[PDB]
Design an enzyme around this catalytic site. Structure first.
Site, PDB file in Angstrom:
ATOM      1  N   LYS F  10       0.729  -1.076  -0.081  1.00 30.67           N
ATOM      2  CA  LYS F  10      -0.053   0.020  -0.078  1.00 30.67           C
ATOM      3  C   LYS F  10       0.937   1.149   0.000  1.00 30.67           C
ATOM      4  O   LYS F  10       2.153   1.211   0.206  1.00 30.67           O
ATOM      5  CB  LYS F  10      -1.072  -0.039   1.139  1.00 30.67           C
ATOM      6  N   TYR F  51     -11.644  -3.757  -3.602  1.00 28.60           N
ATOM      7  CA  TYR F  51     -12.511  -3.624  -2.254  1.00 28.60           C
ATOM      8  C   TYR F  51     -13.994  -3.652  -2.297  1.00 28.60           C
ATOM      9  O   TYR F  51     -14.506  -3.307  -1.305  1.00 28.60           O
ATOM     10  CB  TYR F  51     -11.804  -2.252  -1.531  1.00 28.60           C
ATOM     11  N   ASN F 110      -2.076   0.505   6.876  1.00 30.77           N
ATOM     12  CA  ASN F 110      -1.541  -0.619   7.425  1.00 30.77           C
ATOM     13  C   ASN F 110      -0.624  -1.629   6.450  1.00 30.77           C
ATOM     14  O   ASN F 110      -0.180  -2.637   6.512  1.00 30.77           O
ATOM     15  CB  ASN F 110      -2.549  -1.591   7.855  1.00 30.77           C
ATOM     16  N   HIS F 113      -1.944  -5.512   1.763  1.00 34.35           N
ATOM     17  CA  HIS F 113      -3.078  -6.561   1.782  1.00 34.35           C
ATOM     18  C   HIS F 113      -2.732  -7.704   1.224  1.00 34.35           C
ATOM     19  O   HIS F 113      -1.649  -7.974   0.438  1.00 34.35           O
ATOM     20  CB  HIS F 113      -4.155  -5.611   0.551  1.00 34.35           C
ATOM     21  N   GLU F 124      -9.048 -11.789  -6.740  1.00 35.38           N
ATOM     22  CA  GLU F 124      -8.301 -10.611  -6.637  1.00 35.38           C
ATOM     23  C   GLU F 124      -6.918 -10.774  -7.737  1.00 35.38           C
ATOM     24  O   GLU F 124      -6.583  -9.719  -8.393  1.00 35.38           O
ATOM     25  CB  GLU F 124      -7.760 -10.413  -5.213  1.00 35.38           C
TER      26      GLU F 124
HETATM   27  N1  LIG Z   1     -12.197   1.583   9.330  1.00 36.27           N
HETATM   28  C1  LIG Z   1     -11.336   0.932   8.434  1.00 36.27           C
HETATM   29  C2  LIG Z   1     -11.100  -0.181   8.381  1.00 36.27           C
HETATM   30  C3  LIG Z   1     -10.196  -0.695   7.517  1.00 36.27           C
HETATM   31  N2  LIG Z   1      -9.874   0.005   6.513  1.00 36.27           N
HETATM   32  C4  LIG Z   1      -8.870  -0.591   5.356  1.00 36.27           C
HETATM   33  O1  LIG Z   1      -9.621  -1.462   4.532  1.00 36.27           O
HETATM   34  C5  LIG Z   1      -9.037  -2.567   4.612  1.00 36.27           C
HETATM   35  C6  LIG Z   1      -9.817  -3.970   4.558  1.00 36.27           C
HETATM   36  O2  LIG Z   1     -10.459  -3.810   5.938  1.00 36.27           O
HETATM   37  P1  LIG Z   1     -10.124  -5.350   6.732  1.00 36.27           P
HETATM   38  O3  LIG Z   1     -10.977  -5.129   8.017  1.00 36.27           O
HETATM   39  O4  LIG Z   1     -10.737  -6.324   5.902  1.00 36.27           O
HETATM   40  O5  LIG Z   1      -8.647  -5.695   7.018  1.00 36.27           O
HETATM   41  P2  LIG Z   1      -7.741  -6.732   6.522  1.00 36.27           P
HETATM   42  O6  LIG Z   1      -8.654  -7.800   6.054  1.00 36.27           O
HETATM   43  O7  LIG Z   1      -7.044  -5.917   5.396  1.00 36.27           O
HETATM   44  O8  LIG Z   1      -6.825  -6.850   7.626  1.00 36.27           O
HETATM   45  C7  LIG Z   1      -7.722  -2.441   5.698  1.00 36.27           C
HETATM   46  O9  LIG Z   1      -6.831  -3.278   5.511  1.00 36.27           O
HETATM   47  C8  LIG Z   1      -7.623  -1.187   5.947  1.00 36.27           C
HETATM   48  O10 LIG Z   1      -6.641  -0.616   5.062  1.00 36.27           O
HETATM   49  C9  LIG Z   1      -9.923   1.367   6.572  1.00 36.27           C
HETATM   50  O11 LIG Z   1      -9.503   2.094   5.595  1.00 36.27           O
HETATM   51  N3  LIG Z   1     -10.905   1.785   7.548  1.00 36.27           N
END
Ligand SMILES: Nc1ccn([C@@H]2O[C@H](COP(=O)(O)OP(=O)(O)O)[C@@H](O)[C@H]2O)c(=O)n1
Ligand SMILES: Nc1ccn([C@@H]2O[C@H](COP(=O)(O)OP(=O)(O)O)[C@@H](O)[C@H]2O)c(=O)n1
Ligand SMILES: Nc1ccn([C@@H]2O[C@H](COP(=O)(O)OP(=O)(O)O)[C@@H](O)[C@H]2O)c(=O)n1
Ligand SMILES: Nc1ccn([C@@H]2O[C@H](COP(=O)(O)OP(=O)(O)O)[C@@H](O)[C@H]2O)c(=O)n1
Ligand SMILES: Nc1ccn([C@@H]2O[C@H](COP(=O)(O)OP(=O)(O)O)[C@@H](O)[C@H]2O)c(=O)n1
Ligand SMILES: Nc1ccn([C@@H]2O[C@H](COP(=O)(O)OP(=O)(O)O)[C@@H](O)[C@H]2O)c(=O)n1
Ligand SMILES: [Mg+2]
Ligand SMILES: [Mg+2]
Ligand SMILES: [Mg+2]
Ligand SMILES: [Mg+2]
Ligand SMILES: [Mg+2]
Ligand SMILES: [Mg+2]
Lengths: 132, 130, 130, 131, 132, 131
Positions: F10, F51, F110, F113, F124
């Site tokens: 990212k 996403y 973070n 992905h 994906e």
């Molecule tokens: N409140 C949030 C939660 C997630 N995100 C982003 O959305 C991505 C997908 O969320 P997710 O809860 O599936 O996280 P991961 O599966 O990537 O751990 C996250 O990796 C964050 O980069 C965000 O921008 N704001």
């Protein structure tokens, strides 16, 4: 400024030896930025011959080309101040510890990385790998 | 051959999160911290004193601004042949294997200062640690 | 969620040249230094105040002696959820991936202290940085 | 171009926990361990043989006392141009990028010994690995 | 104190992949000390079968022994506080980042390092590798 | 047991100079790059597809703005149990030893992905590598 672009190849031995991130990280840590990058699972022989066209009369030419198509390569255009000579210095040679080759390589052929050595070199090599 | 030398960790190190990396290179060479100060923003006068021998150079005002553009750490280091050895560790942006050689790529923003002689070391220590 | 927490780098880190290694783990997690002091030998009173909640434990006197047996650094760090996150970075000598987990192997000499709550953080900061 | 050369990890490496750091630098340049011995304390006559060319120097006895002050590891490394390349890796305390340049700062306690010629390599290997 | 000794094997895949110093360094950095160490360019099959004698009825036994003699190994006795369980935790598993196997390995057989798992294990394994 | 999975580095990784650090952690666990693309700026519809399961969440638009705020790298990695193992390497900001555990401290920014199932992996990969 002194802002330049240069062309770097990560040679097949770097993939074989799992040193790809190590090489890229040394360049990243000196504050050079990736401008373009391609992964080749196997580069076209013609691109390689073009790339090393100034070496076409040397004894090692055919073995070099064989090696360069022996595994994957990554071509990268890096940008930064005085990038051409600085990344060249990072590349170094197998005799000089502190540099990429100096720390990590020990062969006249399999030496992990190519970097452009002049502005003229850089323009041409960039053209070869990123015609677009 | 024991000496003390003055090191500044410049604001670009804070910007790029290289503080520990720099200190660790000096630590691993077996030099010891004798004193240390963290400045969220160094008083401008201290900087002008520090770089006084440079006050006539075209780059002076830009240098001072930069030195106050973020945090710095002033460190007194001690060890055998410290002044010369730490200067070598600092190095320059051309030759890899050193702090600047591996990590820096600018004439101004080059991560670290280290005293270059016995006189400048005494003087620089007196500035940051009176 | 922004917080400040107090970290001490204990004398064993100086003994084993792990100072930068420890600071770098915290730096790489994007926590920022807000203030920092180096103590060639911490005043005993500061240590007794710092570990006051421990004064009745069998280990108290041995702990104080150890804490004064070499240099320490007191750092105030700042970042999102700092208190909990830096406590996690500190970890424990059983679980690898943390500072203690990777680098320490003793119940007393374990490299680093980090505040464990909002109250202890405020209090510990006030001790080292009044 | 394959050569073998003899390396000792000196007791200061053990004291400062730099054994793996030193061995890793040689490992990362693609040199291979052909044989290796750990000595909790090397017999002194072995150290004296090893440094016999130095027997008449002022530092000789102090060097040998140092070499027995803690453990050492003797390694035979193999690879292209090994003797010269590992010597370069060893470097000196004035040359950053090398083992001694990055990690050592003493005339005596300098972490690593490496053979410096084909003659010295053959001899040193025979001393530590008579087999 | 809680001072113990334990037995570690660096398996052949670590030499193949140039991870020997990396594995040893992780143990060194946690303040464990080398008490004895041997390099085997190839370990005697019998030593391996002895070493893994509790596994002799398992489907993988013969493939494991084949692998363990497929390249060099290093046997090391490490000493330190609570060394047996602490070095075991360092070893970890291929599922748990932070540990040696967790960061560096990805196979049920070729997993870079063995470490003793009990006092009884340690005594016996040490006996196998360092009878003297 | 060989699988392939999709990874994005990212824009925050580029900003903080952690690209190689992240790629090296995956490299050191013996996973292989099967294909890879660098995007100085990823087309937004690609990020939105990527996403799409999140299209109804409060953070959706802000996440996509972040994802286009700088370069990204999309990688297909191959190796044993790749989807699950690389997810574990990714970890979370509470779990030291993992990429996010050691290097990240934000709910949005973070660093990495990684696909989380065979279905999501196939999809994906098809998004970033339609070929
Ligand atoms: N409140 C949030 C939660 C997630 N995100 C982003 O959305 C991505 C997908 O969320 P997710 O809860 O599936 O996280 P991961 O599966 O990537 O751990 C996250 O990796 C964050 O980069 C965000 O921008 N704001
Ligand atoms: N005898 C040789 C010499 C060089 N080479 C290879 O081809 C390139 C020769 O280019 P060069 O001598 O200009 O070396 P560099 O500029 O790459 O340092 C080297 O990087 C080696 O990869 C070879 O394969 N055999
Ligand atoms: N053109 C320049 C040259 C130097 N400088 C700064 O001035 C400092 C002192 O200059 P110098 O030439 O004595 O460099 P060093 O002794 O620090 O290598 C440098 O470290 C730079 O940070 C600058 O800002 N602009
Ligand atoms: N038996 C013990 C236990 C703890 N201590 C020290 O006392 C400090 C505070 O103890 P603690 O149990 O609250 O440990 P942490 O919260 O620091 O993990 C520890 O970090 C040890 O350095 C000791 O010296 N002897
Ligand atoms: N004054 C000295 C010089 C060298 N020595 C030691 O003797 C060894 C051999 O000396 P040398 O000058 O041949 O050094 P190298 O070839 O090891 O670089 C050095 O590596 C030092 O460990 C010493 O103890 N005292
Ligand atoms: N199916 C299997 C399982 C284990 N093994 C190997 O033999 C050892 C089995 O021992 P184990 O299951 O007690 O694993 P650890 O105690 O080594 O974690 C492993 O370390 C693998 O090297 C194997 O080759 N094939
Ligand atoms: Mg050339
Ligand atoms: Mg100067
Ligand atoms: Mg506590
Ligand atoms: Mg000599
Ligand atoms: Mg078992
Ligand atoms: Mg998800």
């Amino acid at each position: 400024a002194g802002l330049q672009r240069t062309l770097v190849l990560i040679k097949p031995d770097a993939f074989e030896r799992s040193l790809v991130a190590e090489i890229m990280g040394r360049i990243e840590k000196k504050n050079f930025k990736i401008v373009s990058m391609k992964f080749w699972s196997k580069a076209p022989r013609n691109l390689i011959e073009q790339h090393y066209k100034e070496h076409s009369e040397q004894s090692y030419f055919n073995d070099l080309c064989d090696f360069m198509v022996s595994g994957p390569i990554i071509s990268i255009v890096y940008e930064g101040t005085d990038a051409i000579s600085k990344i060249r210095r990072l590349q170094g040679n197998i005799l000089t510890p502190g540099t990429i080759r100096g720390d990590l390589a020990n062969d006249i052929r399999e030496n992990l990385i190519h970097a452009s050595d002049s502005e003229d070199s850089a323009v041409d090599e960039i053209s070869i790998w990123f015609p677009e």
